[PDB]
Amino acid sequence: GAMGSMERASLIQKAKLAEQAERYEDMAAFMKGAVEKGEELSCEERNLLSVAYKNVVGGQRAAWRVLSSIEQKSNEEGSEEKGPEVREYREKVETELQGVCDTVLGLLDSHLIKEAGDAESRVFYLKMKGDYYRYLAEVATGDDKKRIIDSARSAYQEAMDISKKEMPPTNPIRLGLALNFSVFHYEIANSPEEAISLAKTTFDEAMADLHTLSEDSYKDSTLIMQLLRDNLTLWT
């Protein structure tokens, strides 16, 4: 742990600095150091963690897609043989992506999830576990692809069950988890109908609970509801 000698509060301070500087790899390294101090994360600290890794893996995913599309093109009838470089470099980016996902899942498994007893922390980490298995599923093509998909599904499902029992239908974590699990169905599990039904039911139950909110909670909730509707528009 290169971050072993830095104060927990100093790691969190530098995480926020790296965020402002758009240095998300640094941000991620600082938050991994913080998690490895062994203490539970507060709400704000969990969000620093997810923000850091979302941006790192988000750039890796965008590169991987660019390289996949090139590689698939060099495989069309009538493409000129280019040698192994496109596949090699796609594999390099792909390996590095998987290593980031393995790092995040390692943090959840040692020991974020097992200590998370409040709904807000447990659902948040289970959502993350589903997301990072989903990112692994997007590049999976092997013996393990089914089990990686089922790992995503299983994490999302446990997070759904707790969120339905313990949080109001407008809770932003509950909404974001539903949004992502609905994308999992559409994009990964080949179940566009489940994806549609989940996004529609989530949207409509949140709608009917907006009346209970303050104006700031209303903003946070309708922001994510709009993403559900944008997906529905995309899919229908």
């Binding site: 997301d131 974001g176 949004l179 992502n180 994009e187 993403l227 944008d230 997906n231």
Partner: peptide, 5 residues
């Protein structure tokens, strides 16, 4: 691509 958070 569809939206995720």
């Amino acid at each position: 691509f569809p939206a995720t958070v």
